[PDB]
């Protein structure tokens with residue numbers, strides 16, 4: 001059953017028959033018609049390239065019309081199994097759109113959790129608009145001397161409904177929605193604003209070197225990065241706040257590498273302009289081993305998930321050792337994440353990790369408390 | 377946040393621009409056209425049903441007017457939201473939408489080709505399977521020190537009567553992401569196990585008992601066929617059917633299998649408890665494996681072709697290979713280097729610590745007959 005030839009005047013199937021399979025026309029033409037009492041009623045003619053017999057398969061109902069070959073035709077068979085396989089695995093509302101169209105095309109030619117997702121997106125975007133969002137900052141520290149060298153910017157939603165939704169999942173929603181670009185724009189702006197403030201205070205207390213080497217880490221999502229005008233907008237924002245590129249560090253996940261072409265150059269643009277590129281959640285998600293060989297990275301983060309089990313089992317300790325040494329060999333530098341105890345800080349230090357981040361040192365805090373932290 | 381509209385209120389009129397769609401929560405509405413003075417009722421829509429969607433998808437005007445027949449409450453659905461969901465839908469599913477839309481419009485008033493080609497190709501492939509056009513070739517895996525054959529990888533081949541001996545990349549993806557995995561996968565495992573028994577029998581009959589006892593048959597098991605239930609059950613009867621020991625059978629997955637997690641982890645442990653060797657193929661290419669080495673009981677891990685072919689070319693990918701090999705040893709995992717074409721690369725991999733090898737240098741994959749000759 002590949003393609004099949006049928007001759008002129010042959011009824012392929014009749015209306016009211018059971019729906020076995022669909023057909024795509026390769027050669028010739030066919031007629032779609034209804035019959036009422038004695039009169040036959042032509043709905044349309046279908047020439048090559050067009051498809052028919054599909055309706056019956058999707059919703060498991062009978063043939064809504066008859067079909068007859070107006071000339072010699074050649075048809076390519078499409079199976080019931082094939083269409084169901086594709087519709088069943090489709091988006092939830094997309095499947096509704098299909099059912100209404102089917103039912104309307106039939107009815108006329110004769111004559112919650114999906115909704116909840118929509119409502120939640122609106123709740124989040126409305127929350128954004130009423131100024132319920134805020135950035136906190138977590139110190140990144142030099143493990144040797146315990147000195148603060150920078151900070152990661154982290155988003156916060158000040159509402160009791162955030163706990164009802166999920167700590168992570170409101171970011172997932174944001175990231176997969178197209179409210180990414182206006183919110184992302186606000187984040188970058190806010191972080192850059194507070195960076196200027198952090199630097200200004202440091203200089204006014206005769207800490208010129210610490211101010212010159214300070215890093216502001218910003219978490220940039222996949223959609224907002226691969227969007228055009230990203231570097232353009234990012235640059236006028238840096239200009240607006242009078243900042244240098246070496247103090248701004250962009251933090252992506254590995255997943256950004258699966259795209260390829262559209263990403264490569266944007267990484268290289270940021271790299272040529274002087275922005276530091278950091279890879280977060282490394283070894284968790286999309287594999288970058290061979291993509292770390294060719295692309296230009298500055299830092300790479302050993303994720304919480306590894307660090308918390310570093311003393312627990314020796315398997316994940318081996319992996320951390322490996323990551324750290326590999327990073328050095330690649331000329332990449334490392335920030336260990338999720339350090340909660342002095343013991344794990346020591347191990348990471350003897351393994352060769354230079355920089356640290358975790359509750360041991362400091363949980364993320366507001367700008368006020370952060371400015372106080374950098375006076376000791 | 378839904379909106380109430382009173383009786384007789386026109387929501388929108390035909391010919392208006394398409395802002396957004398609506399889902400009816402309470403009440404009923406009428407869909408109608410107007411000609412000159414007379415209005416023509418297409419249908420009535422009650423609660424649960426959706427309207428105003430057509431205009432948004434293909435960016436055309438309102439195809440009909442809508443008026444509330446009673447007090448109704450409507451839930452708003454945005455333009456952005458529908459486009460976001462349809463654009464990210466399956467390729468043929470999007471065709472099915474366009475034909476239905478066009479037919480519902482064209483009759484109410486009265487990326488195409490490569491989508492169809494996918495359907496035709498699946499049928500071509502499955503039909504080819506059914507007329508016995510598939511065959512397994514085997515590629516020697518060799519001990520790098522002594523150059524002795526220690527096992528083989530089973531690789532699928534399509535020897536079409538018109539296309540000829542075509543190679544698996546053009547049709548394995550299709551097979552793997554289709555309902556035809558389970559019957560074809562079953563045939564592969566059976567065929568490989570059948571020919572394993574043969575390989576062992578011939579070895580013993582030539583007084584090579586030790587080589588027969590240590591022989592490995594590598595089988596490439598896809599993600600869908602692994603995560604399917606009855607996998608270990610079917611695998612086990614098949615081993616019993618051919619009178620084979622588990623230590624001679626090695627299952628070869630890609631990293632992707634563990635994006636699932638729970639459903640996989642135990643099936644790995646079942647195979648591991650039963651005595652099957654688990655090998656990870658295409659490591660560092662696809663879904664990140666670093667954290668997968670912490671969780672899984674792995675026996676072997678393959679350094680992919682992609683690394684090996686550039687191992688002399690640039691020193692960056694040589695560092696990565698060194699790292700992988702040492703990490704593997706530290707995890708108590710053993711290594712098979714893949715895609716060795718020159719003696720020089722074989723030497724480097726040997727000094728780096730890789731024990732086993734696979735590549736054209738030694739032998740390309742061949743039929744069972746030629747393989748049985750190779751092992752003398």
Ligand SMILES: Nc1nc2c(ncn2[C@@H]2O[C@@H]3COP(=O)(O)O[C@H]4[C@@H](O)[C@H](n5cnc6c(=O)[nH]c(N)nc65)O[C@@H]4COP(=O)(O)O[C@H]3[C@H]2O)c(=O)[nH]1
Nearest residue numbers: 153154155171187219220221280338339340357358359360
């Ligand atoms: N248990 C433990 N956790 C520690 C410790 N130290 C830091 N953490 C947590 O580690 C997370 C930062 O890592 P991430 O991979 O950027 O993980 C972030 C990041 O993926 C995303 N995110 C946060 N802010 C932004 C943002 O502004 N833009 C985007 N696109 N994503 C953001 O949300 C994720 C979670 O953010 P948070 O809940 O703030 O969680 C933070 C922080 O609270 C520790 O010592 N112990």
Ligand SMILES: Nc1nc2c(ncn2[C@@H]2O[C@@H]3COP(=O)(O)O[C@H]4[C@@H](O)[C@H](n5cnc6c(=O)[nH]c(N)nc65)O[C@@H]4COP(=O)(O)O[C@H]3[C@H]2O)c(=O)[nH]1
Nearest residue numbers: 531532543544545548564596597598715716717734735736
């Ligand atoms: N150029 C070059 N190539 C070398 C060399 N040494 C080995 N190869 C190639 O490496 C491929 C096997 O690696 P794979 O990652 O399992 O790659 C396989 C595997 O992912 C998939 N595949 C093949 N057979 C099966 C199967 O029976 N079941 C499943 N699930 N997948 C299969 O198809 C992929 C390609 O298979 P093949 O075309 O047979 O290609 C083979 C083999 O021809 C070399 O020295 N030079």
Ligand SMILES: Nc1ncnc2c1ncn2[C@@H]1O[C@@H]2COP(=O)(O)O[C@H]2[C@H]1O
Nearest residue numbers: 032043052053054055056063064065479
């Ligand atoms: N109004 C129409 N205009 C064009 N084709 C139609 C129309 N109605 C039905 N068809 C096609 O005719 C086929 C009859 O069999 P099905 O109902 O399975 O699938 C139907 C559609 O593919």
Ligand SMILES: Nc1ncnc2c1ncn2[C@@H]1O[C@@H]2COP(=O)(O)O[C@H]2[C@H]1O
Nearest residue numbers: 104407418427428429430431438439440
């Ligand atoms: N024939 C029909 N049967 C039921 N609803 C229809 C029909 N034609 C159009 N509609 C609906 O009326 C809406 C008018 O605006 P749209 O064309 O955007 O989307 C249209 C459909 O949602």
Ligand SMILES: [Ca+2]
Nearest residue numbers: 152219251280
């Ligand atoms: Ca981060």
Ligand SMILES: [Ca+2]
Nearest residue numbers: 280281303304
């Ligand atoms: Ca992280």
Ligand SMILES: [Ca+2]
Nearest residue numbers: 529596628657
């Ligand atoms: Ca393989």
Ligand SMILES: [Ca+2]
Nearest residue numbers: 657658680681
């Ligand atoms: Ca491989």
